[PDB]
Design a protein around this ligand. Structure first.
Ligand SMILES: */C=C\C(=O)Nc1ccc2cccnc2c1
Length: 307
């Protein structure tokens, strides 16, 4: 019916890694992973559940683990393994600069057009790969992209991710706390999710980046979004955006899903713009901007296990 998912899920001993410090409150730690019987140290982020008495929460972390184990792309976050102690631990690649949402808010005065457009390309490559894998993210947002380096971002948070119905080329959900301000009209109205609903949220994510992390429809209640969208209203042109960039964002927000660009087309359009960034974004001072033993440290991206 479909191709078998031969991804490996790696179980790690808790003695294989050291928590160095806390990054956020379950709880995320900065840490180091020594693959058992390998002379390598891998910077990791270790996500540990708090209560561990919640069967619900345990199902949710393993779903995430299932999806992150099944993706292998330079622009999607990858899981190194899980640890089944009292509290289940997810070990992933450390992404030391944090979320791109925070990163553009914190660095709004240092970020030039070449970085914004290259990020739009990389997120499009990430999302096109996911589409190839028949995977619908359903929660794409500048908060859900992480910064390995200012040159290199990755889509994260597969908590909401689901497969597309090949026989049913759409997903059908039922309740929760949801990101109304990022969602396609068909999603808010009919809980319909596709790759094309992922393109709508890709549009909003590009608007967050191009406004240096402004809040979409700030001050408008979630209850009002569906009406506003139905009245043909959309997020306004960011000051730095040429009409070229903004028109692409607007195409991602068309009511007809099949009228939106494909991720493969967004790769192409942002790359053309990436070859001449000052033609496509106008930024003040753009021209003048730049962004134990570590002996056996290697990045996760240079740590490959056989396929
Ligand atoms: C690409 C693996 C991954 O998802 N890494 C991840 C997750 C959370 C987080 C928080 C703070 C710093 N780095 C990371 C990295």
């Amino acid at each position: 019916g479909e191709a078998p998912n031969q991804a490996l899920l790696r179980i790690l001993k808790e003695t294989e890694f050291k928590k160095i410090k806390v990054l956020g409150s379950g709880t995320v730690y900065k840490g180091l992973w020594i693959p058992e019987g390998e002379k390598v140290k891998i910077p990791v982020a270790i996500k540990e559940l708090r209560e561990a008495t919640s069967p619900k929460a345990n199902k949710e972390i393993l779903d995430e683990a299932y999806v992150m184990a099944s993706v292998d792309n330079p622009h999607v976050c990858r899981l190194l393994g899980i640890c089944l102690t009292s509290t289940v631990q997810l070990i992933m690649q450390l992404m030391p600069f944090g979320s791109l949402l925070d990163y553009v808010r914190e660095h709004k005065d240092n970020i030039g057009s070449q970085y914004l457009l290259n990020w739009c390309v990389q997120i499009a490559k990430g999302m096109n790969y996911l589409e190839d894998r028949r995977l619908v993210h359903r929660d794409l947002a500048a908060r859900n992209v992480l910064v390995k380096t200012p040159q290199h971002v990755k889509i994260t948070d597969f908590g909401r991710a689901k497969l597309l119905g090949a026989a049913a080329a759409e997903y059908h959900a039922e309740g929760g706390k949801v990101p109304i301000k990022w969602m396609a009209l068909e999603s808010i109205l009919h809980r319909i999710y596709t790759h094309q609903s992922d393109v709508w949220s890709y549009g909003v994510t590009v608007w967050e980046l191009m406004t240096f992390g402004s809040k979409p429809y700030d001050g408008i209640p979630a209850s009002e979004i569906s009406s506003i969208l139905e009245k043909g209203e959309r997020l306004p042109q960011p000051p730095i955006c040429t009409i070229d960039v903004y028109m692409i964002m607007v195409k991602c927000w068309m009511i007809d899903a099949d009228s939106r660009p494909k991720f493969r087309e967004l790769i192409i359009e942002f790359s053309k713009m990436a070859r001449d960034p000052q033609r496509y974004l106008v930024i003040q001072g753009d021209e003048r901007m730049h962004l134990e033993d570590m002996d056996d440290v290697v990045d996760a991206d240079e740590y490959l296990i056989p396929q």
